[PDB]
Design a binder for this molecule. Structure first.
Ligand SMILES: Cc1cc2nc3c(=O)[nH]c(=O)nc-3n(C[C@H](O)[C@H](O)[C@H](O)COP(=O)(O)OP(=O)(O)OC[C@H]3O[C@@H](n4cnc5c(N)ncnc54)[C@H](O)[C@@H]3O)c2cc1C
Ligand SMILES: CCC[C@@H](O)C(=O)O
Length: 456
């Protein structure tokens, strides 16, 4: 990367906001996944959208790859600079704007995390529900199409992103639904907002997100329920969903994951396949939901509910940290996560089969999942230096992905494709789907410089 080019970057954002130092680049060459660190040639921190546009235009016209970087909590290598280039760290743009409580909407810049937003909304009666376990950039969550434990009731990022401000690869500024617009529904033209949700930085740089806010629940009850088997817990889940109980949260942990979470969070739950549940409503509605949900779990051997403000917070913090609890089982190890999502009636088959396959293999695995969506993660620890183990781990993850595809599902419910699931995506949507996706990529990024090597 030439000195003239570095000076041009510094001319846009300021000398303190450009770095070519080895250690700074290495810190931006990886995310939380096992994908090997591939450092960008430089890291740049733009301070406003005009600077994002000018950095993108500089890189694009000089043939330099661009890698958007939020909080680096992704798990599919999205920020790995596989072709070098300029990593654009967006988190100094950290303002909340256009809070419209009467309309249930807000605009956030990439440095705003869900914690920051919900703290800012404290005492407003509103909250933002999509809750990945990591303290992630909300614009990064839009870029990956994230979900969370609350999505079963309150929707994913795709359900709750109303508008996006996007710097296209060549620097042009796009407001996907129109500048300043926010509304409940539209048939005006083609829906561009949904194209950029889940684009993982390969179609442009999200510099603001307009988000749907939700009313805080009148009352909340959380509980845990222990089961004799994975089959019993997942059968309960399917039956709760088929009975249309509007549960706020329904999360599965297998016995391995529950033990790991116990050890990492000083919970003391019985070591068993377990559901973490939460219910929202009036006291009337809560009693009815609990009534109907306890009857279903009882039919499948579930324990009496172990009830959980402070404990509920500790319960869900333990769940949100499941990934780190799993990594702590074998210290020094990294991990890969699967993320399949299947039609809910097929969820018992594939979780029970996954548990059986884990036991039949030399691999360690913990299972945790947004099972209310038909989604779960297998977290597979890896010794970073054991090449034989890593390719058993990819073989396992790749077979699980293909089993989900055979059941009519998808290879990723929320994490995305990144570097890890590119072949599975080709199998998932077939040749005409791949070509159509590539045609969209090509019209927005003709030179192929927008996070190359990812998704397609
Ligand atoms: C403990 C833990 C729990 C998690 N739980 C969940 C969960 O429940 N659900 C879930 O969906 N994910 C979960 N994740 C994964 C991760 O937090 C999400 O994928 C999150 O959306 C990533 O945001 P980020 O800014 O950290 O992404 P990064 O790693 O910075 O980037 C991810 C990808 O998006 C691109 N990108 C980032 N910001 C932008 C932007 N502004 N514009 C364009 N492209 C951009 C990057 O180029 C990259 O390809 C979890 C991760 C951890 C570590
Ligand atoms: C990063 C894999 C686990 C994550 O998806 C979660 O559900 O907490």
């Amino acid at each position: 990367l030439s000195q003239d080019f570095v000076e041009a970057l510094k001319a846009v954002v300021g000398s303190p906001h450009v770095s070519t130092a080895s250690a700074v680049r290495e810190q931006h060459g990886h995310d939380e996944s096992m994908h090997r660190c591939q450092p960008p040639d430089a890291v740049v921190w733009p301070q406003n959208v005009d600077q994002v546009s000018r950095v993108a235009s500089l890189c694009y016209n000089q043939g330099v790859p661009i890698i958007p970087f939020g909080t680096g909590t992704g798990v599919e290598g999205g920020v790995c600079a596989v072709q070098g280039g300029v990593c654009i760290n967006l988190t100094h743009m950290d303002q909340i704007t256009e809070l419209n409580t009467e309309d249930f909407s807000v605009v956030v810049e990439p440095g705003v995390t869900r914690k920051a937003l919900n703290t800012h909304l404290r005492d407003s009666g509103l909250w933002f529900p999509v809750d990945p376990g990591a303290d992630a950039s909300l614009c990064g969550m839009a870029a990956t199409g994230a979900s969370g434990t609350n999505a079963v009731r309150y929707g994913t990022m795709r359900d709750n992103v109303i508008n996006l401000e996007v710097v296209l690869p060549d620097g042009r500024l796009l407001h996907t639904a129109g500048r300043g617009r926010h509304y409940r529904k539209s048939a005006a033209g083609y829906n561009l907002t949904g194209l950029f949700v889940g684009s993982e930085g390969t179609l442009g740089i999200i510099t603001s997100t307009t988000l749907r806010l939700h009313p805080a629940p009148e009352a909340t009850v959380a509980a845990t329920c222990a089961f004799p088997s994975v089959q019993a817990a997942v059968d309960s889940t399917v039956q709760i969903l088929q009975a249309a109980v509007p549960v706020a949260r329904i999360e599965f942990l297998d016995d391995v994951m529950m033990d790991a979470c116990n050890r990492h969070s000083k919970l003391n739950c019985p070591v068993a396949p377990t559901l973490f549940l939460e219910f929202h409503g009036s006291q009337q509605t809560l009693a009815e939901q609990l009534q109907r949900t306890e009857a279903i779990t009882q039919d499948n051997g579930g324990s009496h509910f172990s009830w959980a403000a402070e404990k509920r917070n500790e319960l869900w913090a333990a769940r949100h940290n499941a990934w780190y609890a799993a990594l702590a089982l074998s210290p020094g190890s990294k991990a890969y996560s699967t993320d399949v999502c299947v039609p809910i009636s097929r969820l018992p088959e594939i979780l029970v089969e996954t548990k059986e396959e884990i036991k039949a293999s030399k691999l360690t695995g913990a299972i945790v999942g947004h099972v209310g969506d038909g989604n779960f993660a297998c977290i597979l620890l890896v010794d970073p230096d054991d090449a034989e183990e890593q390719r058993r781990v990819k073989a396992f993850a790749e077979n699980l992905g293909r089993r989900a595809l055979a059941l009519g599902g998808t290879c990723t419910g929320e994490h995305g494709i990144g570097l890890g699931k590119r072949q599975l995506l080709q199998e998932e949507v077939g040749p005409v789907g791949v070509e159509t996706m590539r045609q969209l990529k090509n019209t927005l990024d003709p030179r192929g410089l927008m996070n190359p090597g990812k998704v397609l």
